[PDB]
Design a protein around this ligand. Structure first.
Ligand SMILES: CC(=O)N[C@@H]1[C@@H](O)[C@H](O)[C@@H](CO)N[C@H]1CO
Ligand SMILES: [Ca+2]
Length: 885
C-alpha cells in the first residue's frame, strides 16, 4: 500500500496543445492531460509489476466524471479492476478506489464522461501497491501466416487442379448444406449431379430418381443449392431464411416431383452485399452465422458476394512497407463496427484500436469463407486499390504526393495518393498499389478475378487530376496484377460521373453496380457506354425497420430491363443491412430465374403459404392489404422504410428520425390496421409458425409506429394551444403506447439489443475486458449516435441506424420522449420555459455504459401473446378508434 513514486511513465494517443499525457503524473494538481479526440484513455506504466491496493484520480475542475480502470500483468490482457459511474462531482480531495491486491505492470484509465465538456482530463493519478520484484514480459509482435504455408492453400489448389476431387467436394458440401438446412435425416433423400451449363447459362434440374429420392442437377454448387431450394418451395411448402424466419417442417414422406423440371438463368452474376452490410448487420458475426448466410445465398442463386473479411491484415502488411508500425496501423483502421466507411475511404480510427489478435483471426475467417465459396462456385469480390493512405503518409514518405480528401460527416477522410505525377516526381500510387495487390495475394491467394474499390465515394477531392485519367490508371494497375481482373464499381447518386467512367479503357473488365435500381435506377448511362452493369435492389438503409418493399417493381422492371439492354450482366441486392422485409429479398433473387414479368400478387400468395406452412382466405386477405398499403408501388424518392416517430429526437415538427430519412406514411393507416386485426383473429391457428410470429410482430409494431405519429401530432397541438390538461392526457397515452411497443418488440430474438451487444462482446475468444468494453462501445454507438458529437450532430449521423428494438426502446427512445414531455408539462403547468436539451450528451451516456457493470440486456425473448397485444393496440392505441380514445 505504498505510493509508487518512481519509475512511472504514461502514454496517450491524443491531447490538446500543452496538455500532454505526462502532465497526468507530474505530481502537480494544476497541470492536466486533456483529450483531443475519441481516444479518451491514458496508459500508465508502473516501472514493474505491483500488487495494487489503491488508485487515486484527480480531475482539473468540479465536473462529474465517469471512467473505467483496467490493469495488465502480462502486457497484453487489460482487465477491468475499478470504475466510477456515479454522479458525484469531482472535488479537491480526488477519488480514491480500493483495489483487491491485483497484480499490474500497466494501467489504462478510460474517461468516458465529462459532464462539462466533450473533452476529458486527468489532473493527477496516484497508484499505491507493493512491488513484486517482477517485470512485464515482452509482448510478441503480431505474427500472421502466409496463405501458401497453410492447409488452405493445399486444399484450394487441389480443388483447382483435380476435377474429380473438386466435384466430390462440391457434391459432399451440398449434401452437408441439406443437413444444416432441414436436418441430417434428409441428406440421403437427395442425389446430386453436376451437369453442364444450358447454352452458356447456369441451370438446375429437379426430378424423381425412381426409388423415392429427389435427383437434382446443376452446373455448380450454387445451381445445385438453387435446385434443392426449388424443390423445397414448390413441392414441400418449405421456406428457408436463417435471418428473417423459416418454415422447415418437412412432410412425413418425400413428395414426388412428377414431370422433370429444367430451369436456367440468363444472368451471369447474382450479387449480394453493400459495404454497409458488413457494419450494420455483420459486424459481430461468427462463422456459424456466415455459414448460414452462404447456405442461404447459394440456395437463392447468389454467385457474387462482396468480401472484406480480414482486409485489415492485408492493409497492415501494406502499410508496414511504408514506415507504419503495427500500432500506427491500428490507429488508422477503424473499430469492428465501422469497416464499411473505413474501406469506402470515409473515416479512420473511430471505434479502435483493434486488438492484436484480430488480424490472424480475421485472415483465418476469410480463408474459411473462400474455401466454402470455392466449393459452391461463389465469386468473392476482394479489394482494389485507388490510393487511400493515412493523412501522415507524406511525413513518413517525403517524396509521396497526396490529395487531402476533406471531411465526411465530421470525420477526417483519409488522404488519396495522386493517381499520377509529373516526370521527375516519385509515383507512390504505383509503389503502394503494387505492394497492396501483392500483400492481398499473400494473405488469401488467388481466389477471384473481381475487385471492388470506390474513390470519391460520397465526397473527396480530385485535386488537379483529370477524372477519366484517374480511372484509366486505377483499372490498368488492377489488370497489371490480374490480367482477368474485373473492377466492380458502385454507382451511387450519379457518381462516378460519365467523364470518370469514360476513362475506363477496358469496358469488359469493369462492372458497375446500379445501387438503387428499385427506387432511383441509373443504368441507362452505363448501358449507353457499353459498361457491364448489375440491377440491384437496395431497399434497406441503416438497418432502419418498418414495412416497406417494392414487389411489383421487382416482378416487372427487372425482366423489362433485361429485354431493353445488352450489357445487363446480372441482378443483386445492395442493402445497408439484412434485417427487414424478407419478401423483398426472396422475390428479387427469384427474378433471376425468369425472362418474363410475373404477377407479384400471385407470387406473394404462394410465398406466404410456404413461409407459414399453411394459409387460408383471411391470411391471404391480410397480405393483399399489405400489398395494397405498405408494399404498394410508389414513384417518389425515399431512402428506406418510413421511420418511427418513437425513434426520433423529440422536438417540434419532426418529419424523420435520421437526416436523410422520412416519416411520411404514404398509405391509409386505418386500412393497414385491418391486416393486424386479421392476424390477431388467426393468431391461435398460425402461432405454431415462427415466421408468422415474425411477420405479426413486424406489422403490429408498424401499427403502433403509425399511431404514435398521430398521437404526437395531437400532443403537439395541445402544447401550441396551451392546453396543459390535454397535453398531459395525450402525452400519457403516447408514453403508454411506447411501453406497449417495447412489449411487442420483446417477443422476437431478432429485436433484442442484448443479442447485438453480446455478439460484440463475445465475437473473439480469450479477449480481455478492455476489448469487450470497446466492442460494446462499437455496438451501442452505431445504432444511436453513430459517432461522437461532431459526427452525430454537425455530421448529421444522429440515429441514422435507429432500430425498433427491445431494450433500446425502453432505455433510450422512451427516456428521450419522457424527458421532453416532462419539460413541456412543467412549462404548461405555470413553470419556467422548457430548457434546451443537449440530446447527444444524454444519448452518449447510454452509449458508454458497459454490460458487466451497468445493466445486462437479455438474450432471451419474452412469452407475450402477440394476438393479445394486438387486441390492446387496436382497442387503446389505434388510429381507427382514436376519437373514442
Ligand atoms: C451513413 C451511411 O451509411 N450512409 C449511406 C452510405 O454509407 C452508403 O454507401 C450509401 C449507399 O448505400 N447510402 C448512404 C445513405 O444515404
Ligand atoms: Ca498534473
Amino acid at each position: 500500500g505504498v505510493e509508487i513514486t518512481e519509475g512511472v511513465t504514461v502514454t496517450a494517443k491524443g491531447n490538446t496543445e500543452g496538455n500532454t499525457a505526462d502532465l497526468a503524473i507530474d505530481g502537480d494538481l494544476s497541470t492536466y492531460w486533456e483529450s483531443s479526440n475519441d481516444y479518451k484513455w491514458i496508459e500508465v506504466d508502473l516501472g514493474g509489476i505491483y500488487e495494487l491496493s489503491k488508485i487515486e484520480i484527480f480531475n482539473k475542475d468540479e465536473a462529474v466524471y465517469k471512467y473505467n480502470i483496467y490493469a495488465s500483468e502480462d502486457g497484453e490482457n487489460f482487465n477491468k479492476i475499478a470504475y466510477k459511474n456515479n454522479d458525484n462531482v469531482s472535488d479537491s480531495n480526488g477519488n480514491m478506489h480500493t483495489i483487491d491486491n491485483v497484480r499490474a505492470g500497466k494501467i489504462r484509465i478510460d474517461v468516458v464522461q465529462n459532464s462539462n465538456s466533450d473533452r476529458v482530463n486527468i489532473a493527477e493519478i496516484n497508484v499505491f501497491g507493493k512491488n513484486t520484484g517482477e517485470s512485464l514480459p515482452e509482448v510478441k509482435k503480431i505474427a500472421t501466416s502466409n496463405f501458401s504455408e497453410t492447409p488452405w492453400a493445399t486444399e484450394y489448389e487441389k480443388f483447382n487442379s483435380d476435377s474429380a476431387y473438386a466435384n466430390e467436394k462440391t457434391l459432399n458440401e451440398i449434401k452437408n448444406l441439406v443437413g444444416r438446412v432441414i436436418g441430417r435425416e434428409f441428406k440421403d433423400k437427395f442425389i446430386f449431379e453436376i451437369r453442364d451449363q444450358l447454352n452458356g447459362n447456369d441451370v438446375f434440374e429437379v426430378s424423381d430418381s425412381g426409388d423415392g429420392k429427389v435427383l437434382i442437377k446443376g452446373n455448380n454448387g450454387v445451381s445445385l443449392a438453387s435446385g434443392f431450394n426449388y424443390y423445397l418451395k414448390n413441392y414441400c411448402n418449405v421456406s428457408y431464411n436463417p435471418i428473417m424466419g423459416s418454415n422447415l417442417k418437412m412432410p412425413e414422406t418425400m413428395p414426388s416431383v412428377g414431370e422433370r423440371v429444367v430451369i436456367d438463368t440468363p444472368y451471369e452474376h447474382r450479387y449480394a452485399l453493400n459495404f454497409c452490410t458488413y457494419s450494420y448487420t455483420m459486424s459481430f458475426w461468427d462463422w456459424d452465422q456466415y455459414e448460414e448466410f452462404l447456405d442461404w445465398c447459394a440456395m437463392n442463386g447468389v454467385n457474387l458476394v462482396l468480401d472484406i473479411i480480414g482486409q485489415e491484415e492485408v492493409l497492415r502488411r501494406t502499410l508496414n512497407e511504408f514506415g507504419y508500425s503495427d500500432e500506427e496501423v491500428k490507429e488508422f483502421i477503424s473499430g469492428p463496427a465501422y469497416f464499411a466507411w473505413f474501406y469506402m475511404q470515409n473515416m479512420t480510427g473511430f471505434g479502435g484500436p483493434l486488438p492484436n489478435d484480430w488480424f490472424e483471426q480475421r485472415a483465418e475467417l476469410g480463408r474459411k469463407m473462400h474455401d466454402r465459396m470455392q466449393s459452391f462456385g461463389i465469386n468473392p469480390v476482394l479489394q482494389g486499390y485507388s490510393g487511400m493512405v493515412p493523412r501522415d503518409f507524406k511525413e513518413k514518405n517525403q517524396e509521396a504526393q497526396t490529395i487531402s480528401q476533406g471531411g465526411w460527416c465530421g470525420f477526417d477522410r483519409p488522404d488519396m495518393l495522386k493517381t499520377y505525377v509529373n516526370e521527375g516526381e516519385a509515383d507512390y500510387f504505383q509503389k503502394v498499389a503494387d505492394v497492396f495487390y501483392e500483400k492481398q495475394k499473400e494473405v488469401f491467394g488467388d481466389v477471384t478475378n473481381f475487385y471492388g474499390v470506390d474513390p470519391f465515394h460520397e465526397g473527396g477531392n480530385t485535386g488537379d487530376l483529370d477524372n477519366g485519367k484517374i480511372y484509366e490508371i486505377i483499372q490498368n494497375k488492377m489488370i497489371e496484377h490480374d490480367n482477368d481482373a474485373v473492377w466492380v464499381i458502385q454507382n451511387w447518386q450519379g457518381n462516378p460521373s460519365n467523364n470518370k467512367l469514360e476513362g475506363l479503357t477496358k469496358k469488359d473488365q469493369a462492372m458497375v453496380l446500379d445501387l438503387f435500381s428499385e427506387v432511383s435506377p441509373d443504368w441507362n448511362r452505363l448501358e449507353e457506354r457499353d459498361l457491364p452493369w448489375i440491377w440491384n435492389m437496395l431497399h434497406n438503409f441503416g438497418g432502419r425497420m418498418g414495412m416497406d418493399a417494392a414487389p411489383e417493381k421487382l416482378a416487372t422492371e427487372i425482366p423489362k430491363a433485361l429485354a431493353n439492354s445488352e450489357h445487363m450482366v446480372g441482378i443483386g441486392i445492395t442493402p445497408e443491412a439484412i434485417n427487414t422485409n424478407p419478401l423483398a429479398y426472396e422475390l428479387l433473387f427469384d427474378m433471376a430465374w425468369t425472362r418474363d414479368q410475373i404477377n407479384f400478387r400471385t407470387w406473394t400468395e404462394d410465398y406466404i403459404e410456404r413461409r407459414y406452412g399453411k394459409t387460408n382466405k383471411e391470411i391471404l386477405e391480410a397480405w393483399n392489404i399489405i400489398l395494397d398499403t405498405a408494399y404498394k408501388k410508389r414513384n417518389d424518392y425515399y431512402q428506406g422504410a418510413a421511420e418511427s416517430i418513437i425513434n426520433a429526437r423529440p422536438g417540434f415538427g419532426i418529419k424523420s428520425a435520421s437526416t436523410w430519412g422520412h416519416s411520411k406514411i404514404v398509405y391509409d393507416k386505418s386500412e393497414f390496421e385491418k391486416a393486424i386485426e386479421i392476424f390477431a383473429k388467426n393468431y391461435d391457428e398460425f402461432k405454431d409458425s415462427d415466421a408468422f410470429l415474425y411477420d405479426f410482430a413486424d406489422i403490429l409494431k408498424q401499427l403502433l409506429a403509425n399511431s404514435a405519429q398521430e398521437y404526437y401530432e395531437v400532443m403537439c397541438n395541445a402544447y401550441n394551444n396551451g392546453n396543459g390538461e390535454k397535453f398531459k392526457f395525450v402525452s400519457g397515452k403516447f408514453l403508454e403506447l411506447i411501453k406497449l411497443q417495447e412489449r411487442v418488440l420483446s417477443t422476437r430474438p431478432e429485436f433484442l439489443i442484448g443479442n447485438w451487444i453480446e455478439d460484440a462482446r463475445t465475437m473473439l475468444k480469450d479477449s480481455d475486458d478492455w476489448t469487450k468494453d470497446l466492442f460494446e462501445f462499437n455496438a451501442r454507438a452505431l445504432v444511436t449516435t453513430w459517432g461522437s458529437r461532431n459526427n452525430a450532430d454537425g455530421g448529421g449521423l444522429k440515429d441514422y441506424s435507429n432500430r425498433q428494438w427491445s431494450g433500446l426502446t425502453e432505455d433510450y427512445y422512451y427516456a428521450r420522449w419522457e424527458k421532453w414531455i416532462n419539460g413541456l408539462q412543467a412549462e404548461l403547468d405555470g413553470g419556467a420555459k422548457a430548457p434546451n436539451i443537449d440530446w447527444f450528451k444524454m444519448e452518449y451516456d447510454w452509449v458508454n455504459k458497459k454490460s458487466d457493470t451497468d445493466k445486462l440486456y437479455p438474450t432471451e425473448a419474452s412469452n407475450e401473446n402477440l394476438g393479445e397485444l394486438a387486441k390492446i393496440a387496436m382497442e387503446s392505441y389505434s388510429v381507427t378508434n382514436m376519437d373514442k380514445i
